[PDB]
């Protein structure tokens, strides 16, 4: 379902990373497979060539935490009006306090040690169940 359409109509885009994270742009190909693209360091922009009807999403490159693009999950290049590139503004979402805590804990504890933390079993499963594009594709579908 979630796939790019093969339009062949060019569309220039600025990927603008207004987050403090290293960003991984991910293009959903014509079969719906995620294809990773070169990363963007914090605060940087790239002018890129994509196409109308192509689908992109954006993640933290290190952790795969979800990012927003123009305030939504998915970005589709649109028609360039008067030769201007489309801006894709990549931002942090307001994470829930729980997800933000899980992020910090995962950044400090090696996965083989999650079981050594003194927490309810359900929080072990929440640490192990880390963010992943495939699962978000299943959810968005």
């Amino acid at each position: 379902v979630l796939r790019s359409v093969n339009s062949r109509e060019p569309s220039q885009v600025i990927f603008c990373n207004r987050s403090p994270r290293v960003v991984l742009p991910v293009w959903l190909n014509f079969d719906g497979e995620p294809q990773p693209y070169p990363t963007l360091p914090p605060g940087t922009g790239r002018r890129i060539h994509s196409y109308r009807g192509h689908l992109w999403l954006f993640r933290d490159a290190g952790t795969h935490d979800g990012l927003l693009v123009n305030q939504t999950e998915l970005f589709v290049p649109s028609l360039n009006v008067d030769g201007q590139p489309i801006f894709a503004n990549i931002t942090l979402p307001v994470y829930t306090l729980k997800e933000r805590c899980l992020q910090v804990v995962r950044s400090l504890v090696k996965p083989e040690n999650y079981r050594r933390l003194d927490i309810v079993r359900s929080l072990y499963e929440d640490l192990e169940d880390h963010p992943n594009v495939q699962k978000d594709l299943e959810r968005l579908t």
Binding site: P93, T96, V104, L123
Partner: protein, 86 residues
């Protein structure tokens, strides 16, 4: 309209009612003071800052900064967020 949230060590945090309703757990405990026997002040102060942060940056246009969490409080804060469902 403010509510009072009280830590396990007796610190009393006064926050706007609508900010506190960020937590469905807190909503149930009200529906206007709440005592938390398992949440200490160094954790509950951070939860209150989260409420302010969430309400300020939800449905906003201006760039969103990272919500900061010291490594020392992350575990307790994780347990509190799980209980409070925020």
């Amino acid at each position: 309209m403010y509510v009072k949230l009280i830590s396990s060590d007796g610190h009393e945090f006064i926050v706007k009612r609508e900010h506190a309703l960020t937590s469905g757990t807190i909503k149930a405990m009200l529906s206007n003071e709440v005592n938390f026997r398992e949440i200490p002040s160094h954790v509950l102060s951070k939860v209150c800052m989260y409420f302010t942060y969430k309400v300020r940056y939800t449905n906003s246009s201006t760039e969103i900064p990272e919500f900061p969490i010291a490594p020392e409080i992350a575990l307790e804060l994780l347990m509190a967020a799980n209980f409070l469902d925020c």
